[model samples]
Target: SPFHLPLNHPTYLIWSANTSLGKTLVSTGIAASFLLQQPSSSATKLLYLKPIQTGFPSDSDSRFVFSKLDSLSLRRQIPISISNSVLHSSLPAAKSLGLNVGMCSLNFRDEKTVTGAPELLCKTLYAWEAAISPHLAAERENATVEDSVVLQMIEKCLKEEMDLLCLVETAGGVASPGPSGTLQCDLYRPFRLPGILVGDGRLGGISGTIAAYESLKLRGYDIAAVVFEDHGLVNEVPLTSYLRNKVPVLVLPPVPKDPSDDLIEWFVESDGVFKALKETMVLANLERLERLNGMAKLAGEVFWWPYTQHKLVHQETVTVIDSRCGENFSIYKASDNSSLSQQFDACASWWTQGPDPTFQAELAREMGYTAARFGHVMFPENVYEPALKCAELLLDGVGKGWASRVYFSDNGSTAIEIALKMAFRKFCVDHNFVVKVIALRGSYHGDTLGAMEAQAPSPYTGFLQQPWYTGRGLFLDPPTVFLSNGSWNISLPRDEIFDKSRDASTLARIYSAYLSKHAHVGALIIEPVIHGAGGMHMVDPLFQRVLVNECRNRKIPVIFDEVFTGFWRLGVETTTELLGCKPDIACFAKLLTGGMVPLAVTLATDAVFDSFSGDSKLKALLHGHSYSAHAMGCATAAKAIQWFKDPETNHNITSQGKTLRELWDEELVQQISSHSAVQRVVVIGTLFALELKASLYAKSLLIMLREDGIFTRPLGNVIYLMCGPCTSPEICRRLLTKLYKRLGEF
Candidate 1:
């Protein structure tokens, strides 16, 4: 349910800009300040954990903190008794660990909490004698330490211990590699502990510190404080100016050269700086908690949510999100040790996400460059590099072969709205008659009025939601497809639902001449196989192909709302490839720009585009958003359009760039489909869905799955697990493993 050092633990990480920057000393001082100055005199505990300490026995960080803290406590003449254990869980400690025990059930459980205080409770997890990068040090020791093991131990200690202040100090510089060759920042990102970066305070330290600071910021870590020893280079002054009120910076007096006596005086002199540093760290911790709590209250009080009832939603119900990276959300609960948790974003954030962390970083750079180069330029006649490049990409990739022009907009709804205009213009030009569209029932296009008007009357099209929606389409009840009881099955509507009167001539079979309707069928629009919002239902690809053929025979323009199903969402670049057909006009969004920002495009065939052409401006389609082909959006998509199909970028795709690597296990999907609890299941591309026999299970299933670290939202009785195109198959299997287990239990 939770990820990150049990929330509100006040666990500040001790990191440095460069090696030998006195991170250990900073850690020691921070610990002493917190331990000595008791907050309310309540049995205070301070835990100093060094996850990957390289120079083990000869030069141990945890030992130094332990010994130095012990001496400092005694010199105060406070008559304090220092005693307790230093849980130095080295890589070799597995010999003492239980042979047959799960990592979680290890013996690191707290032993009847004294808060382990009047004591410096130091913990060094993996230690080695070699004074080098932990990666090489671990190699020399012939030790295998997985990132998970290290994370688990730290999580256990922080969670189980009654420590008021916990500091997990790292081995080297913030960018240094850990035991497994993973960067220190990358290794500790999941826990996302607040940082107190120990900056280099010598010559050329400015560049190193700023670069290190930039590195950490790029990975989404918050800097609470930056402290460094005064090397008399005035580095602190420049740093103070550079930081400029964003982060509190502190400068400490230099340590003695000859300290065989190990100067109690150095610790004494720097005591003032330590106090200030502790206050800043404490304040940052407090602000985070207060801000999180206040946000929940503020959300309900001010903002009216979409697809949500404010009356039913309250402060307690609100899950204030802290941040998102890749395929997960780090949520802040504003409560307990679990104030924050990392939950798998199983639904791909409403089916809009695709990029992995690496790609996200790339896109961020692209977006930044475009923002700086061209923020938001006019798009009607002007041509910027991003817009031009993006149009080229669109025409080459998803819009290849059929589409000749791209009409940019702000969202899927707006994109669909534009496509309708293009289709209408083409149709009206060919036949001078007012016409209604040919559409399938329960097919959702978007929330906009123009797009909404095309969709048939449903709960969404009710007068209360959209008052002026005068259902102007001949909506057919297309057969829905699914995998049921280990076999493909279809759900058909009643015979009377279709009318033969609308048709001028009819064939003998009712099923064969399904599209033998009247001439008013100007445009045929469909979601193309998968109707995401409409219960995540699947329409048979073959049926859509036949429908498209029938529309082509009638010379009716086809519009495929490829918004949800576009760009690797259905394992293909376009569902046109999946359905063995093409749409005269197609709308794309969500995954259009890798879901980074709102940017949509409606692709039109040359025929339709020509219909809008003439000498007069009035003859052309004249609809656009203020941010049509916005540079940042185009820039992000410019990179993403290439990244998704590039073998090097997304290795799971085929060399032909036609299909994606099968992420869902067929056997597991079948097993779930065959379950009594599940009535129907559909596994396609990155989407795994199942309809429950009873809606009750699905109603509460959202919360349960969420608590299990799987973030999901149910669509009616249908619950779907949607992964990004780049999501690992192992995580997909893990989600289903939980889904199967939990569904069976129900």
Candidate 2:
């Protein structure tokens, strides 16, 4: 009954379940069975990829448990057709011959380089695959090539010689949609490649996996089976994940079917107890993977009634092949709470989650008197997947897959927190400085501890000086203005300041001059091109480039605190895109999660991350909160990135943003001088800030802006509008109108 003779019919596996459901064992066992059953004359090949891996390579306990089956099968074969040579190093080979090249950081890049991008890697791997395995017929036509450009490239990466590529994903840490699972990025989208979705404790039996699976379905792939492999469950179906969708679940039998049993041994035995661990249940699991193509799908089902009258809909389309897609919208408003403000906010967040009743009602309201409309969240318009387009652009500029190790936190403050820790810990290891931080006169990173120390030390510091480490500090005067260590401030002319503030070469010299004297510098931090707290000052990108280079040469690490300027704020979140102005580490937040949730992130290269990779537990970057990666926050940020790529949003930034920018310029010049109370109005990417005549708001501008129906906030004298992505031209006009009225009246 197998379609491809030796290969068995390709039933793409979709193992969906939570911790301790034994999905890993079942999937791996299937892989092992396939490998062992391979006809000697067949010589089939196999490959594996995990976009993200967590909890294992953990403290030598059950290390064999859930070890990827493709890798596990390598040791069992004669010459080891399925090998482990690829995992030997993280470095990608760029040799003239192009052998031994596989998934790596370069493969992670979003660029078009043949040696670096995903497509190139796929091409190289496929060529190698054909050479290594002769049984793969040269004539079989591969199906599912039209998913996306990325999928086509992935198809090219997986040649015919390889029977299958198992991709493991490790993000979305417990909360992710079905087709939108944390690891769904590299999962089933390409060439109809079958994948295993491992749920972080968050998704196992919850609707997250179903949502992710649905996203994949939109692209046209029916997950063959689902697995529930979370470590926590002891049995019994929960109304969460896999059960919610009634998808087939392959489970890892709960450990300690009774709590009185030894937890560790239970796992070891289930993984097949072995000395030096040769031929484990893990291996059996791997061998069984290829056989799972025909395993019976789980049939039991459970349901929930969030609303009784709601209708759920589904559909399919055929392009390169037939694929399924579906959506459900509400018939009534989900929120019936008192008060209009709370209702509006609820509707906004719901629209964020995709089609629901409120979204339909809002659309109907727009049609002016009960007109109905229906549509699946469109490409690059819907959040999550659309963000990939923005990611793709940045990847194009930077080149590959999660190439940089990104750490997630919530909000700008936490982004700074994580980045600062990475830098400081790295400095402690390399330069031997304790927990000290440097300060620039007018710099303001954020309001958190690590960021607070590095931010503007005037108003904020004066207000909370008790919190600052005043003893370990160095204050550099801002080029535009200088305040002598909490004393009087003096303004400098632009040309004069440019002369004083050296260009890249000279700035490096100054940094070296000052740094050489200190000998205890932890992280030479800067806001990079724009110093926001310093009256929203802008600097040359070249200055940052050379200064960073000099710091690198001096064996000092450079940290780009991009909280203010990140995510198209200053230019882009990607450092490499900004004219190869690469920062060793980047601190990101604010717009990171779409400015919707209070989330942050810190990204660093392995060089910085390695400092925390010591044997002792103390060497670990002992940081994180209970909500370090709260699923809701992750979902919001993930969706935020999605909107960033939406054509409407990106298009607005280019077209509408340009128009708004012009209007902002003309409006400010026309009206700013008339208002004696206003000092200046600064505008960038729809962000408008008005400086008050006084250091603080003389009148309650917040209340006035409220009256005008614009939710603008003032950072000291600067009144700024961080308009949401969906805010349309009419919305912008209304906001600007209110702002103008308030400015005139006040």
Candidate 3:
């Protein structure tokens, strides 16, 4: 069969833009158009990847983007696994033991870290050769009929099936740094390589927009395609230069400022379309058109080819002034001397009194950081010390450290995956029984198959770029009452959903119940204190202690998926440590490597490690990646960690978390929660979610937010407010005020 190019190649339709622009929506639209446009006789694969994200899995942006691809109608596709990881996150096998607290943090020294070079090299080699090896068993050989069957069988074990391999890059950019001049604390180092990169304007808060791009460049990532704000990073000269000259860059137009209390959804949608147009690649399109034009014009102009080729012989400038001279002629416009001689600055006053501090302070909010941080000086060791100190501080405050199995990957999702494998393997060996993992409903772990099983937010596995399992793994309702550890159920006040007291009794009951229900269960995995993807459910740490204790007593491991809760998001190292709790396994991403890239970490306890002492290869954890423990991710993460531990950073997060938390109580919260159109209002740390009774299409509400020049994302029916470290109270106040005014119309 011959491959035919569609009118609009989905890949060529929209290029890359800076973060915060509605790139996800546009990508989805294009992908849908292409799939629908294609003939039924052929099948193709579509892949999407988001390299770096902040304040996620709380952000909800990545989920929104992938869902566009996953939910769209399409032809045959491939199975792809998208992963968002922490920078230093280790890829533990399903049988690895001891990946918990007190474990020596894993580094590139412990795993192969050649992600950028070797992986691509091998992939290109594989494509160029496209040859089959004669050796090896049917199941272990190349991707043939037998191997496909085996892969399908393995996928069936998890009950997850997919058609296309939409290999999403859950984590990346750890090899880079942020505006703060270092990597974020949540990067997953092992998976620095990315298939595609999405830009979200670094939370679009104060200094995040442009600085993020610079950091990405420092990391040596190919500018896949930028999705950015119109007047923001995408249009700027330097950034634009990168887009046009370096890589495909998309410039999503900035949503206009609208004070009108219009429908927020309409606002986001309208702006998203306009933004998509502004960022559309007209030059690339013209080039393709030029190709067609060249063929037609060549045949028509054969008689005058030489003259037309060298000069526009038919245009006004192509006429020869003197026929004897036989040279191309052109007319030129004279300089506007009158305009230049008008003495543009003659009327301006020359007196200057610019020494005032107020004058210095009057600089634009967007210009301050960008202008000052032109190669700002920073200490390298100081970068990573903060994160380690944060961990140490957490350890001291919590008074516990178990296995000390610190490992890093490229993002949070990958971190969770690592923890799951390690926990499962440990459970299998210790109990000598089938190990089953439990995940919560309405929760999301990540785009990768393993993380997808952990969250099961939707039936997205089938949307991958390559053929694979798209089926979902096990999902169960979260225990309403934890009865296994002998405790009372904690009652939660409507307004005090996140209040710590509400979790104490619940934890105890749940722990007891879990132990009794599944003797073969590997580990009880929870999103820790705040269930970010599960609609920011804030539970008590006492409950956490109950599960931790239960696991300790039963020798079953407890895994805390801290991808969203880490990096001071909860105003602490983690909700677990804040309440003096410790789980045998913990997975953290996002800010782990400082939000500069994709990175994850899965810490395990000693008990789990002891499970793999046998000499046989089966006893060892078998999971690994080409970029496991990447060096650049390590550097970025080390810096991010140190920044996290810094006194200023810690103090700032504590104070900011406190102030930001109060914003939840303001009129916006009260109004949204009380509105008949609204269903619920949940706030935790810096995350505020408003659930509307009407349409759950977040894009609609997002449209409204964009019109006000405020960038806010929606999760289904819920509108969430999340800010970065530097988000000021005033900015938040204005944002919420605008939101409340807008909600009044709804």
Count of steric clashes across candidates, in order:
2, 77, 150
List, residue by residue over 234-294, the lDDT tens digit for candidate 2: 3225433445644444444444557555344434344431221222323333544433322
lDDT of 2: 0.42
Candidate 1 residue-wise lDDT, 1-746, digit = tens: 24555665688888899888888889888877877754425456677788777665567777788777777777764323333233433444334343231111223422223343454577767665556778887776576578777888788887787437878887788889898898888888767778888898888898889888888887778999888888888887777788886898899988777857586888889989999998898889888888877887898888987899787886887877888767878887645555677788887887898988667766876776788889888887788899899899999989887999898999999998898888888788787745688888878888888888778887777879889888888888877878887887767771111223322223223544665643366888999878888888887666677788788777789999999998889787898777767789999999988978888999999999999889999987788767788898888888888898787898668667445888997778889988988889977878889888767778677777876888887887899999888877887888888888778667
Q: What TM value does model 3 have?
A: 0.45
Question: What is the lDDT for 660 in model 3?
Answer: 18
Q: Write the per-residue lDDT of candidate 3 for residues 690-711, one digit (tens) a residue.
A: 6666564456655565445444
Worst 10 residues of 3 by lDDT: 120-129
lDDT of candidate 3?
0.43
lDDT of 1: 0.78
TM-score winner: 1
Report how far residue 57 has shifted in candidate 1, in Å: 3.9
Off by over 4 Å in 1: 1-4, 38-42, 78-117, 136-144, 258-263, 334-338, 494-512, 654-658
lDDT of each: 0.78, 0.42, 0.43
